[PDB]
Enzyme design. Structure first.
Site, mmCIF file in Angstrom:
data_model
loop_
_atom_site.group_PDB
_atom_site.id
_atom_site.type_symbol
_atom_site.label_atom_id
_atom_site.label_comp_id
_atom_site.label_asym_id
_atom_site.label_seq_id
_atom_site.Cartn_x
_atom_site.Cartn_y
_atom_site.Cartn_z
ATOM 1 N N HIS A 36 6.358 -3.906 3.805
ATOM 2 C CA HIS A 36 7.895 -4.007 4.337
ATOM 3 C C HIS A 36 7.655 -4.806 5.799
ATOM 4 O O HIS A 36 8.773 -5.131 6.397
ATOM 5 C CB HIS A 36 8.729 -2.860 4.712
ATOM 6 C CG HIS A 36 8.312 -1.852 5.691
ATOM 7 N ND1 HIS A 36 7.373 -0.611 5.760
ATOM 8 C CD2 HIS A 36 8.442 -1.807 7.241
ATOM 9 C CE1 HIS A 36 7.265 -0.392 6.741
ATOM 10 N NE2 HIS A 36 7.867 -1.098 7.705
ATOM 11 N N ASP A 63 4.334 -0.123 -1.007
ATOM 12 C CA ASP A 63 4.715 -0.692 0.281
ATOM 13 C C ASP A 63 3.410 -0.976 0.993
ATOM 14 O O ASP A 63 2.474 -0.335 1.552
ATOM 15 C CB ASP A 63 5.434 0.375 1.236
ATOM 16 C CG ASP A 63 5.810 -0.156 2.616
ATOM 17 O OD1 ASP A 63 6.418 0.540 3.553
ATOM 18 O OD2 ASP A 63 5.657 -1.343 2.846
ATOM 19 N N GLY A 141 7.402 0.899 14.629
ATOM 20 C CA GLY A 141 6.228 0.055 15.065
ATOM 21 C C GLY A 141 5.068 0.519 14.745
ATOM 22 O O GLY A 141 4.187 -0.498 14.582
ATOM 23 N N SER A 143 4.264 1.467 11.468
ATOM 24 C CA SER A 143 4.074 0.739 10.420
ATOM 25 C C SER A 143 3.178 -0.208 10.064
ATOM 26 O O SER A 143 2.849 -1.225 10.878
ATOM 27 C CB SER A 143 5.328 0.221 9.517
ATOM 28 O OG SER A 143 6.433 1.058 9.806
ATOM 29 N N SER A 159 3.734 3.903 6.069
ATOM 30 C CA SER A 159 4.962 3.346 5.666
ATOM 31 C C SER A 159 6.032 3.659 6.153
ATOM 32 O O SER A 159 7.066 2.827 6.516
ATOM 33 C CB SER A 159 5.046 3.721 3.914
ATOM 34 O OG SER A 159 6.230 3.253 3.538
#
Length: 198
Positions: A36, A63, A141, A143, A159
């Site tokens: 993502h 993801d 952030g 992620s 994720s």
């Protein structure tokens, strides 16, 4: 730039995410991160400099992504823990109940335990299935960032999670946290990647 798990990078001069792990694909340098975080061909920058581009991604459903880097980048078998480092030693998957930590640009290095596997997240874009769950806290952030055991076994990449109005789930008890990571092993095999270890 020196490629270390947990550090910030930007995508097309806009979003910020966190590096997962240094990897190679034959002669090509790379890092794994969350799908993502960027679309194929999106430009990654670290320290204001272009370091590479998104080579491939699956999101939603999965993801995952990897960023192909220029030869000038320095791959390191490391994840940031404050000013220090956790050495990446392998990718042995830990069981539910294991202690695990994660690293990212918003909440830094946080630890907890793995509480469930095969979890579905319903994100705005669609469901992502097969996620592992821990109770280390995280925030917006983080992620893409590393999940790794203290013994250096890389687990996956950040994720999502049940962030609160302050943008993180650090202000609620561990028992109430759902912090979800994409397992590393299927990312490595899907893209033919080898983890940089030390």
């Amino acid at each position: 730039a020196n490629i270390v798990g947990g550090i910030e990078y930007s995508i097309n001069n806009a979003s910020l995410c966190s590096v997962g792990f240094s990897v190679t694909r034959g002669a090509t340098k790379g890092f794994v991160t969350a799908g993502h975080c960027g679309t194929v061909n999106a430009t990654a920058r670290i320290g204001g400099a272009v370091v590479g581009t998104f080579a491939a991604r699956v999101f939603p459903g999965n993801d995952r992504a990897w960023v192909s880097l220029t030869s000038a980048q320095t791959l390191l078998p490391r994840v940031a823990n404050g000013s220090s480092f956790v050495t990446v030693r392998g990718s042995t998957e830990a069981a539910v109940g294991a202690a695990v930590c994660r690293s990212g640009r918003t909440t830094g290095y946080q630890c907890g335990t793995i509480t469930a596997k095969n979890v579905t997240a319903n994100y705005a874009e669609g469901a992502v299935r097969g996620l592992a769950q821990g109770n280390a806290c995280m925030g917006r952030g983080d992620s893409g960032g590393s999940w790794i055991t203290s013994a250096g076994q890389a687990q996956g990449v950040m994720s999502g999670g049940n962030v609160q109005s302050n943008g993180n789930n650090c202000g609620i008890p561990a028992s109430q946290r759902s912090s979800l990571f994409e397992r590393l092993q299927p990312i490595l095999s899907q893209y033919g990647l080898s983890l940089v270890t030390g």
